[PDB]
Amino acid sequence: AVFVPMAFFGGSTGAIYRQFSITIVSAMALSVLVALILTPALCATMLKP
Amino acid sequence: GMAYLFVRLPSSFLPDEDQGVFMTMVQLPAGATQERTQKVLNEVTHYYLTKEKNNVESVFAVNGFGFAGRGQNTGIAFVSLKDWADRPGEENKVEAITMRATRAFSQIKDAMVFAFNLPAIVEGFDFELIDQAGLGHEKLTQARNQLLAEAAKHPDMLTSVRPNGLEDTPQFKIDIDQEKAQALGVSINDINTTLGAAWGGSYVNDFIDRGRVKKVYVMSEAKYRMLPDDIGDWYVRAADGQMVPFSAFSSSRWEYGSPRLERYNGLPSMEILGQAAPGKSTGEAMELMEQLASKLPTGVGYDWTGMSYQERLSGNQAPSLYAISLIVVFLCLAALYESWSIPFSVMLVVPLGVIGALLAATFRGLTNDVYFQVGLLTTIGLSAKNAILIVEFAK
Amino acid sequence: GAAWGGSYVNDFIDRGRVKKVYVMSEAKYRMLPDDIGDWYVRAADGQMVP
Amino acid sequence: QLLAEAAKHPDMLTSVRPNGLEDTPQFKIDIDQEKAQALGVSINDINTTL
Amino acid sequence: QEDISDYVAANMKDAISRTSGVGDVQLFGSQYAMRIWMNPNELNKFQLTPVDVITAIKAQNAQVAAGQLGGTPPVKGQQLNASIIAQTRLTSTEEFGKIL
Amino acid sequence: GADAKTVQDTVTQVIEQNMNGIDNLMYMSSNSDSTGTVQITLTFESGTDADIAQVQVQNKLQLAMPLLPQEVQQQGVSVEKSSSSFLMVVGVINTDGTMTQEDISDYVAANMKDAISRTSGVGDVQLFGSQYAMRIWMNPNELNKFQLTP
Amino acid sequence: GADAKTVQDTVTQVIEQNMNGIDNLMYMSSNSDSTGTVQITLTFESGTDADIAQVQVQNKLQLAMPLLPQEVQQQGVSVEKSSSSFLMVVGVINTDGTMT
Amino acid sequence: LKVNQDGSRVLLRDVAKIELGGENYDIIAEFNGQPASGLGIKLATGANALDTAAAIRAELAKMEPFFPSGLKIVYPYDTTPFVKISIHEVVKTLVEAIILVFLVMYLFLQNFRATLIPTIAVPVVLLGTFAVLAAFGFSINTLTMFGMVL
Amino acid sequence: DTAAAIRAELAKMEPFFPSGLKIVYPYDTTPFVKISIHEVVKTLVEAIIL
Amino acid sequence: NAVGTGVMGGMVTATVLAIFFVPVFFVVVRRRFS
């Protein structure tokens, strides 16, 4: 939510800032989906006492 | 401390990166023959391959073409550097060579030379006076001189203010006496064609060249169209079969004219560029010129263009959005922390992260460019991530 | 065409702007069918037949 | 030359043929400029009428 | 009406017609055109024809390119280059009156 | 062979005056120079389709095309939806040196330019030189001798 | 009324030279038949906007027509999409031959 | 031209020097201070810069064999190689960052078996960020890569 | 948006008019648009209050 | 270099100060605003 509001930053420079917010936000989204899909599954059967 | 550093930091669009290629522009005073430009351009080519042999790999000197306007008294020289790894240190970076080159070119007395690094995008302020009332080119030119001359009265707020259009150069006006032509029995069209064909190439037809179509130009030989007195040689046939010279029915007089007329939004104009004060930001310079343009001859307006026009649209959207971001994060934080008070403990940490960015940014003159905004907008996230990673367990 | 309906010939520069040059008959001389009998055309011998 | 080679590889190529028409006899008319002006007849007239 | 109609066509129709979102613009009037009002009687007295006026006006009002004095390619050893200005558009009513 | 003044007053304005009705037009800068090459550059509002933007501008150029001087029409009046900064300059050079400067220009102008100018992603192709054009160098002294005119 | 060479060397070459900057131009092929006919077929990459392709290619031609001879301009030059096939070919015949 | 009295013929050879030459001599191009020519290429609006450069280079490579003896191509000024190397310079940091982070991760976690978990998730996200980038249409660029390094 | 742009454009050239020239907007539909929306939004506000 | 300096400085101050200060606010808000 810190990066999304700048995504609507308009003007000629709007595209510049707009791309950065989406990729960062998209990176977080994929980072929380995988961290809730792969990391939980991986931590089991991979991490050992 | 964060507030003080934030304001003092200058505002800029994007750093001029070392792209490995800079374009060297060479210009000569009014009426400089193509031969003279080739003489100077050799010096630029000679200089680069002698003083900068360690840096420049190749030089492509183009004579007769330039961005300021095609002509004989202009020149450009595309230059490409060796591999970035082949230019160790900062003394051999693009900004360094151009400063040495431009300083080294102060000894080219006749010509004006300055190598400027290619900008960030493909394409300072671009200010343009417009003669919206119809004063005329000559009237506007002096008006341009007044504003630019008066611009020298504020060196602390304006810098490197210069025109972009070629200055007036002598023109060899020739007038044809209408009455004399009829008496001598020479058609006006005949006079115009021979004058406009001999002294200037006249497209005629097409021919086949090794299986290709190419233009056939008719134009006077080089030696016979070089001096004003040569007009006395071009006899033109009269209707009655007689031959008459140009001097018999025409007169010539030297007069001043403009070799590059520029227009804007459908009105006459010329372009003036320059930097915005020493060290200050570009925004400040814009307002002062409006005041300068306020007291100008009647009918002389102005309008922005190029990159400066962009700043007039979405000029200050950055502060507005950050308020939304701070508001949105406050609302979202309160949603997860079940309180309207705890979210402060991870908001009042934001300055602790921003100060490091500003402190280091001003530690190297990052000039608050676009790359800084992402830096500021991500370090704030890192500080939020750190705080959220601490208070969360405490709760 | 030039006498009655006018004929655009070429341009001219006014206040630094291009504007058309129109050749046309004066109002009082192209307003009735009778006026058609006043226009003369120069023949090869220049007798100005109507 | 190239087509003549393709005819020597039947196992690999078949029916290799040109697509465009071959050369055809044409009637050439030479309008000698020397005589054209001597007779006092415009060259464009010769081309136009022909 | 002629004077005011000229100015709007002269210096406002173009600027307005390029403003974003504005399509075709219809101008209630017309810009100045240097009307040549002719008298059939005057042509008769001086033995002239209107096709002569158009030919004359189309000639003495002509703007023709005249090349560049000492232009490229130059002869080796030249130190001057300037444009040549031939006949130009006339720019005033009285100027056209000087046409012969 | 056109003075900078005429191109402003017989080519630039004629094209400029008819240049109305375009959509998403921010500003329209233009200039005419001594060599006689008007260059009107229009910058549309950001985000518009350059593919059709070139159609709208040219469609309004047709209304002005006949009015231009016969010589300019005969020349290559062209409209390009290309930026104003060179993407990359491809240079041709003769190692042996048996070819003069103009000779190399013809080969690049006669064979390279046509193929490169059509390659996808290329808007404009400026050529440093000029293709062979048969020049008929006149001698005014000789022309007067035989009572001839250009 | 023209032969093969006089068409290729005066129309096809003139048109081909000025066809530049087209969007997604795949390959340009042209044949200059006898009987004064020329067909410059341009093929684009699959999936391109046919309407946009046709307008651009014609527009570049519209800026090259003045270089063509006088007869070609009078006879006119068309720009027809080709890949489309005929739904049907309605034929009209005369059963008695009275009218040719 | 004409057949004057006495039967003498005056040919264009006798009143005008004829020699092939460029259309206009305004532009002269020199490479390394010796004769040469070249083509200035402007990127069409909306076309990918690198893709245009690759297409142009392929087209030129499609014509090199047929050049006359001694003629050579040179790229005296090319901005595209900077873009290619620049982006491939950030990827070095992105790969370098993962190694450095993993090295730091090993030092603290003190367990290679556990330290391997973080270094699997990060490549998945970074690679995945490209897939979502395609959906939005964004082109991998300097800032978008910086939108993953940070 | 166009009407404001036109009004802004006219204000740009207003200072440079000749003496005695004035701008008047005899016919424009934008005032109706503004009041109509303002009237409707007022009704929407009144709808919530009711 | 532009991006690195912006965040390199920010991160360094974001950990050598946040850990010391984040605890301060948490107790202060929960004691003064709760």
CSV table of C-alpha atoms in Angstrom, one decimal, chain B residues 57-225:
chain,number,residue,atom,x,y,z
B,57,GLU,CA,37.6,4.7,-30.4
B,58,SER,CA,36.3,6.4,-33.5
B,59,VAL,CA,35.0,9.8,-34.7
B,60,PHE,CA,32.5,10.4,-37.4
B,61,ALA,CA,32.7,14.1,-38.5
B,62,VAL,CA,29.7,15.2,-40.5
B,63,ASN,CA,30.1,18.6,-42.2
B,64,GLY,CA,27.1,20.6,-43.4
B,65,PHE,CA,24.5,19.1,-41.0
B,66,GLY,CA,23.5,20.0,-37.5
B,67,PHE,CA,20.5,20.0,-35.1
B,68,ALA,CA,20.4,23.8,-34.9
B,69,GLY,CA,19.8,23.8,-38.7
B,70,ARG,CA,21.3,22.4,-41.8
B,71,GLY,CA,23.7,24.7,-43.7
B,72,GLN,CA,27.3,25.3,-44.7
B,73,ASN,CA,28.3,27.2,-41.5
B,74,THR,CA,27.4,24.3,-39.1
B,75,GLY,CA,29.0,21.0,-38.3
B,76,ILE,CA,28.5,17.9,-36.1
B,77,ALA,CA,30.9,15.2,-35.1
B,78,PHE,CA,29.5,12.0,-33.7
B,79,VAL,CA,32.0,10.5,-31.2
B,80,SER,CA,32.0,7.1,-29.5
B,81,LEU,CA,34.2,6.0,-26.6
B,82,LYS,CA,35.9,2.7,-25.9
B,83,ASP,CA,34.3,0.1,-23.7
B,84,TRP,CA,33.3,1.4,-20.3
B,85,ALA,CA,35.7,-1.1,-18.7
B,86,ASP,CA,38.4,0.3,-21.0
B,87,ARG,CA,38.0,3.7,-19.3
B,88,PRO,CA,39.0,3.1,-15.7
B,89,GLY,CA,38.4,5.9,-13.2
B,90,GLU,CA,36.2,8.9,-13.2
B,91,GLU,CA,38.6,11.2,-15.1
B,92,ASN,CA,37.8,9.3,-18.3
B,93,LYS,CA,34.0,9.4,-18.1
B,94,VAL,CA,31.9,11.2,-20.7
B,95,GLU,CA,31.4,14.3,-18.4
B,96,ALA,CA,35.2,14.5,-18.0
B,97,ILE,CA,36.1,14.4,-21.7
B,98,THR,CA,33.5,17.0,-22.7
B,99,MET,CA,34.7,19.4,-20.1
B,100,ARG,CA,38.3,19.0,-21.3
B,101,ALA,CA,37.2,19.2,-24.9
B,102,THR,CA,35.1,22.3,-24.5
B,103,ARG,CA,37.8,24.0,-22.5
B,104,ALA,CA,40.4,22.8,-25.1
B,105,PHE,CA,38.3,24.3,-27.9
B,106,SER,CA,38.5,27.8,-26.5
B,107,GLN,CA,41.5,28.2,-28.8
B,108,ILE,CA,39.4,27.7,-31.9
B,109,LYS,CA,39.0,31.4,-32.4
B,110,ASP,CA,36.8,31.5,-35.5
B,111,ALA,CA,34.4,28.7,-34.5
B,112,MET,CA,32.2,28.0,-31.5
B,113,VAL,CA,32.5,24.4,-30.3
B,114,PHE,CA,31.0,22.6,-27.3
B,115,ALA,CA,30.4,18.8,-26.9
B,116,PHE,CA,27.3,18.0,-24.9
B,117,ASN,CA,26.4,14.6,-23.6
B,118,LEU,CA,23.4,13.0,-25.1
B,119,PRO,CA,20.4,13.5,-22.8
B,120,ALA,CA,18.6,10.8,-20.7
B,121,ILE,CA,15.7,10.3,-23.1
B,122,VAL,CA,15.9,10.4,-26.9
B,123,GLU,CA,14.0,13.7,-26.8
B,124,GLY,CA,17.3,22.6,-19.6
B,125,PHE,CA,14.3,24.9,-20.1
B,126,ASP,CA,13.2,25.5,-23.7
B,127,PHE,CA,11.8,29.0,-23.6
B,128,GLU,CA,10.4,30.6,-26.8
B,129,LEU,CA,9.2,34.1,-27.6
B,130,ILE,CA,6.2,34.3,-30.0
B,131,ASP,CA,5.3,37.3,-32.2
B,132,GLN,CA,1.6,36.8,-31.8
B,133,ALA,CA,0.7,40.3,-33.0
B,134,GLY,CA,2.7,40.5,-36.3
B,135,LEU,CA,5.7,42.7,-35.4
B,136,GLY,CA,7.9,41.0,-37.9
B,137,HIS,CA,11.2,39.0,-37.6
B,138,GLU,CA,13.4,42.1,-37.2
B,139,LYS,CA,11.2,43.6,-34.5
B,140,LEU,CA,11.1,40.3,-32.7
B,141,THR,CA,14.9,39.8,-32.9
B,142,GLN,CA,15.6,43.0,-31.0
B,143,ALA,CA,12.9,42.0,-28.5
B,144,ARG,CA,14.8,38.7,-28.1
B,145,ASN,CA,18.0,40.7,-27.6
B,146,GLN,CA,16.3,42.8,-24.9
B,147,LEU,CA,15.0,39.8,-22.9
B,148,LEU,CA,18.3,37.9,-23.3
B,149,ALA,CA,20.3,41.0,-22.6
B,150,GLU,CA,18.2,41.7,-19.5
B,151,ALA,CA,18.6,38.1,-18.5
B,152,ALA,CA,22.2,39.0,-17.8
B,153,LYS,CA,20.8,41.2,-15.0
B,154,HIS,CA,19.9,38.1,-13.0
B,155,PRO,CA,22.9,35.7,-13.1
B,156,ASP,CA,22.0,34.4,-9.6
B,157,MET,CA,18.6,33.1,-10.9
B,158,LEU,CA,19.4,32.3,-14.6
B,159,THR,CA,22.4,30.7,-16.2
B,160,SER,CA,23.7,30.1,-19.8
B,161,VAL,CA,20.7,31.8,-21.4
B,162,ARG,CA,21.3,31.6,-25.1
B,163,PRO,CA,19.4,31.7,-28.4
B,164,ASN,CA,19.0,28.6,-30.5
B,165,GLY,CA,18.4,30.1,-34.0
B,166,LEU,CA,21.0,31.1,-36.5
B,167,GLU,CA,21.6,34.9,-36.5
B,168,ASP,CA,20.9,37.1,-39.5
B,169,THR,CA,23.4,36.9,-42.3
B,170,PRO,CA,24.0,39.0,-45.4
B,171,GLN,CA,21.8,38.3,-48.4
B,172,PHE,CA,22.6,39.2,-52.0
B,173,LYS,CA,19.3,40.7,-53.0
B,174,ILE,CA,18.7,41.1,-56.8
B,175,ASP,CA,15.6,43.0,-58.2
B,176,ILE,CA,14.4,42.7,-61.7
B,177,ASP,CA,13.1,45.8,-63.4
B,178,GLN,CA,9.7,44.9,-64.8
B,179,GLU,CA,9.6,47.7,-67.3
B,180,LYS,CA,13.1,47.0,-68.6
B,181,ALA,CA,12.4,43.3,-69.1
B,182,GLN,CA,9.5,44.1,-71.5
B,183,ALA,CA,11.4,46.7,-73.5
B,184,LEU,CA,14.4,44.3,-73.8
B,185,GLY,CA,11.9,41.5,-74.8
B,186,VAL,CA,12.9,39.1,-72.0
B,187,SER,CA,10.1,37.1,-70.4
B,188,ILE,CA,10.0,37.3,-66.6
B,189,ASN,CA,9.7,33.6,-66.4
B,190,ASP,CA,12.9,33.3,-68.5
B,191,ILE,CA,14.8,35.6,-66.2
B,192,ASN,CA,13.6,33.8,-63.1
B,193,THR,CA,14.4,30.3,-64.5
B,194,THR,CA,18.0,31.1,-65.7
B,195,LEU,CA,18.7,32.9,-62.4
B,196,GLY,CA,17.0,30.2,-60.4
B,197,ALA,CA,18.5,27.4,-62.4
B,198,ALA,CA,22.2,28.4,-62.9
B,199,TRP,CA,22.8,29.6,-59.4
B,200,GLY,CA,20.6,26.9,-57.9
B,201,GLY,CA,20.1,23.3,-59.0
B,202,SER,CA,16.9,22.8,-60.9
B,203,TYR,CA,15.4,19.3,-61.0
B,204,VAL,CA,14.7,18.4,-64.6
B,205,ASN,CA,14.1,14.8,-65.4
B,206,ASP,CA,15.1,11.2,-64.4
B,207,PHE,CA,17.5,8.7,-66.0
B,208,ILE,CA,18.5,5.1,-65.5
B,209,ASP,CA,21.7,4.4,-63.6
B,210,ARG,CA,22.8,0.8,-63.5
B,211,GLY,CA,19.2,-0.3,-63.3
B,212,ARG,CA,18.1,2.5,-60.9
B,213,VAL,CA,16.2,5.7,-61.4
B,214,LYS,CA,18.1,8.8,-60.3
B,215,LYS,CA,17.6,12.6,-60.6
B,216,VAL,CA,19.3,14.7,-63.3
B,217,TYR,CA,20.2,18.2,-62.0
B,218,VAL,CA,21.1,21.2,-64.1
B,219,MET,CA,23.3,23.7,-62.3
B,220,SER,CA,26.0,26.2,-63.1
B,221,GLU,CA,29.6,25.0,-62.9
B,222,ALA,CA,31.3,25.7,-59.7
B,223,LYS,CA,33.7,28.5,-60.8
B,224,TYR,CA,31.1,30.7,-62.6
B,225,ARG,CA,28.7,31.2,-59.7
